[PDB]
Amino acid sequence: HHHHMPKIWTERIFDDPEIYVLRIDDDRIRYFEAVWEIPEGISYNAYLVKLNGANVLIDGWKGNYAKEFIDALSKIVDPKEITHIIVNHTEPDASGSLPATLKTIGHDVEIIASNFGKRLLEGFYGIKDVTVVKDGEEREIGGKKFKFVMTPWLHWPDTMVTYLDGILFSCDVGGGYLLPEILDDSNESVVERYLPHVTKYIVTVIGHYKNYILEGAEKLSSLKIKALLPGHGLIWKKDPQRLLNHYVSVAKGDPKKGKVTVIYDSMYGFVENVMKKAIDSLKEKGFTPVVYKFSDEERPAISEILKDIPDSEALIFGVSTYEAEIHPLMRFTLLEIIDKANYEKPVLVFGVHGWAPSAERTAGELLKETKFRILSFTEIKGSNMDERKIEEAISLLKKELE
Amino acid sequence: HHMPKIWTERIFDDPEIYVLRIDDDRIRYFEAVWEIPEGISYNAYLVKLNGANVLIDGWKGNYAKEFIDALSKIVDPKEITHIIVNHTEPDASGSLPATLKTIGHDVEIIASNFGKRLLEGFYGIKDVTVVKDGEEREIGGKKFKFVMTPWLHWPDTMVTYLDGILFSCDVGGGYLLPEILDDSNESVVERYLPHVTKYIVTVIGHYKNYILEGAEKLSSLKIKALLPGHGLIWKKDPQRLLNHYVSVAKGDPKKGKVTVIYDSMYGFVENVMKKAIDSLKEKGFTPVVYKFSDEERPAISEILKDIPDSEALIFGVSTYEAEIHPLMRFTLLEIIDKANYEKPVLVFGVHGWAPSAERTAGELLKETKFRILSFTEIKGSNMDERKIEEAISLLKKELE
Ligand SMILES: [Cl-]
Ligand SMILES: [Cl-]
Ligand SMILES: [Cl-]
């Protein structure tokens, strides 16, 4: 139960151009896109640029906060004075407030989007009068030059970024989960605590298209960037390159020394017994394991597993079998890793030798179609398990990472 | 500090039979997957006979010490002579190593063929008497009959018949920690049965055809009592429990029941499904609704429990990247695996820009027993509500 209304920020963050952020902190939402566990919440950031002869709204808020958005907006400008609305991306977490915004303005305005964005505004809302902008197209508005850069598949085909005097309104690109205690990247401690939640956002929202992050960062690199103002999380006025470098590093899967992520199901405790030993062996050898275990008492968040993949030196899977080859949570977890975090990293598989029908795909053969490099398979036995084979696998991994 | 509740009670006089039941209120996910906030009991039995004492099954391994202590209150463990293992899964057999140690001398362990193999694999136990289908054994002056019921839900599964009393372990079990031991209270029985259905679909669902086979196999035996490894003991009306098992396995429907399952990423699916659900209610159906949204996430075990007695299902599906929404994928795969029934379905789905390569909900349902009466596209603005009305009307007609 929430004791207070969501926090709203409304603040001028630049003098020239005169730019305001309108940010609402969604601490109601539990599952982003109705799937990714985000107990930390997410912000929706829209922007208002007040110019000479024009007032430009950039993006908006999720639809359940439409009324709050209009109230907030009306505190910094008479909505009737709005002339342009730029829609970088049409997903309803950014565009949900648009119908109520259009009604409140009460007259036609120029709505600007990508080609695909125009089609989607029609499909979602019935909005038909939209100006399509092309890649690199410039537009003079209120005496300033706006430039629009298409960055498709980050993470929809309609995605673009808006460039104004070195200031990039990037919507999802550069977004992150978490409700930071400040607006921007001015505090180092804030930045360090925020970045893991940026990783979590990249992998969950953009991970399937992680190769396009590399494309997009390179495309954006050619522009003079003085600040990056995304649709979620922190605004980067001080060091936007650090954010871009983080995005690229997550996309490439640059590893953190000693990090090994160990993911397993233990249906009855036999997998646990082997994996506890695998984990102890790792700690003995200088590694710092991150452990996700599906047991009869505990159940990790898939969003948290995914977040830890990119900077792992390696993964280890422990797979319960018995009657079937892959049990439901392991299967879900593998399929999501395949979909969102397909990296060229070494992997150990430990598995129970069950009596599953031969036609059933094993965890190994699912993994064998990915970029992951399975070093070895180790059988999880019951009473006559040979602990030396566990030590063997961990030593094999240590040598591989050496 | 709180301790899980243990029941030890003599439940028959001749033969002299005791139940030892522990109510597991710590477990959250049965088999590490099925959401069971209601918990589950482990029921073992001791039969005290003339010249023998026979333990039948046991408890989960984390309760081994509680098991020995409970057992020691009704018999000196050294006086045990036989242990019958209906099924080797650790929720029933985890206590076996500690029990053998406490007994302190050799006993005859009896199991099925696959049972003996699994006892060796799990625990290194090699001295086990294998009994065959229909084999009878004289023990302590009584005749014990063994009946193989494989794939309920493992190939080692058997049941033990003793003068009309069936020790059935998993067969006839259920989730929930019932307020009493047995089937002597109607309202307790009523509240309990849906938890039996939940247990059947989740644990045995994939092999539901073998329930029907098992039912007619036991049909040649006069069952006066059913003593399963989980949940309620049935002494008054074990037939009622058997009929329930069969009805779930057949998927006998409750008239008017439609289960509606959907994900709504941003409210567009929600808007279509709200009209669908309303249309069902106005036509006299009683929908059961499961919504994956950005605030709510139903338990898959609850969705599964409602499938067998639904007249029909309705799915509302969002497109996601190349495929469908991950939670609906997971849910479809489990329904197909555990609840593959010959029932009608409506699909409502958003039109995506997904790669044509990847699988849709309909393709997933192709090799199953479900039949899709129609597919209806979910749109934002300009959604033709008449399409929703006609889909529901079509379903009503199909169900007459
Ligand atoms: Cl296990
Ligand atoms: Cl939706
Ligand atoms: Cl899945």
Contact criterion met (CB < 8 Å) for A383 and B123: yes
Distance from the CA of A333 to the center of ligand 3, in angstroms? 8
**Out of A96, A208, A355, closest to residue B321 by CB:** A208
Q: Facing residues of B314 across strands?
A: B260, B346
Contact criterion met (CB < 8 Å) for B124 and A336: no
Q: Structure tokens of B153?
A: 């839900």
User: Resolution for this model in angstroms, one decimal place?
Assistant: 1.8
**Out of B26, B320, B334, closest to residue A328 by CB:** B334
- Chain A: closest CA distance from residue B198 (Å): 17
Contact criterion met (CB < 8 Å) for B29 and A331: no
Helix, strand, coil share (%) of chain A residues, nearest 5: 35, 25, 40
Do residues B357 and B326 touch, judged by C-beta distance below 8 A? no
A379 SS3 class: strand
Contact criterion met (CB < 8 Å) for A296 and B321: no
* CA atoms of B296 and B328, how far apart (whole Å): 14
Q: Facing residues of A113 across strands?
A: A132
* CA atoms of B279 and B273, how far apart (whole Å): 10
**Out of B90, B155, B294, closest to residue A31 by CB:** B294
Instruction: Please give the domain boundaries of chain A with CATH numbers for all domains.
Output: 1-253 (3.60.15.10), 254-402 (3.40.50.360)
**Out of B26, B28, B293, closest to residue A34 by CB:** B293
Q: Are strands A314-319 and A259-265 parallel, antiparallel or unpaired?
A: parallel
- Chain A: closest CA distance from residue B320 (Å): 9
Contact criterion met (CB < 8 Å) for B265 and A33: yes
Contact criterion met (CB < 8 Å) for B264 and A323: no
Contact criterion met (CB < 8 Å) for A126 and B380: yes
Do residues A43 and A23 touch, judged by C-beta distance below 8 A? yes
Q: Facing residues of B345 across strands?
A: B313, B372
Contact criterion met (CB < 8 Å) for A268 and B381: no
Do residues B63 and B71 touch, judged by C-beta distance below 8 A? no
Question: Which ligand neighbours the alpha carbon of A295 most closely?
Answer: 1
Positive or negative torsion for Cα B85, B88, B90, B96: positive
Count A/B contacts: CB-CB distance under 8 Å. 115
Chain B residues inside the 8 Å CB shell of A157:
353
* CA atoms of B177 and A15, how far apart (whole Å): 66
B176 SS3 class: coil
* CA atoms of B296 and B315, how far apart (whole Å): 17
A389 SS3 class: helix
Give me the torsion for CA of B74, B76, B80, B84, rounded to 10°.
40
Q: Structure tokens of A35?
A: 């799937």
Contact criterion met (CB < 8 Å) for B123 and A382: yes
Chain A residues inside the 8 Å CB shell of B155:
355
How far is the CA of B17 from the CAs of A143, A336, B9, B48, B109, in angstroms? 93, 50, 9, 6, 19
How far is the CA of A119 from the CAs of A90, A135, A148, B344, in angstroms? 10, 17, 17, 35
Q: How was this model experimentally determined?
A: X-ray
* CA atoms of B157 and B148, how far apart (whole Å): 6
**Out of A31, A294, A381, closest to residue B32 by CB:** A294
Question: Which ligand neighbours the alpha carbon of B264 most closely?
Answer: 2
Q: What is the distance, to the nearest Å, from the Cα of residue A121 to the centroid of all Cα atoms in its chain?
A: 23
Burial (CB < 10 A; 0-12, 13-18, 19+), residue B315, is buried
Residue of chain B whose alpha carbon sits nearest to that of A32: B294
Chain B residues inside the 8 Å CB shell of A92:
266-267
Burial (CB < 10 A; 0-12, 13-18, 19+), residue B42, is buried
How far is the CA of B295 from the CAs of A132, A288, B267, B288, B352, in angstroms? 34, 34, 12, 19, 23
Do residues B32 and B88 touch, judged by C-beta distance below 8 A? no
Chain A residues inside the 8 Å CB shell of B91:
268
Query: Backbone dihedral region of A299: left (phi > 0), alpha (psi from -120 to 50 degrees) or beta?
Result: beta
Chain B residues inside the 8 Å CB shell of A205:
none
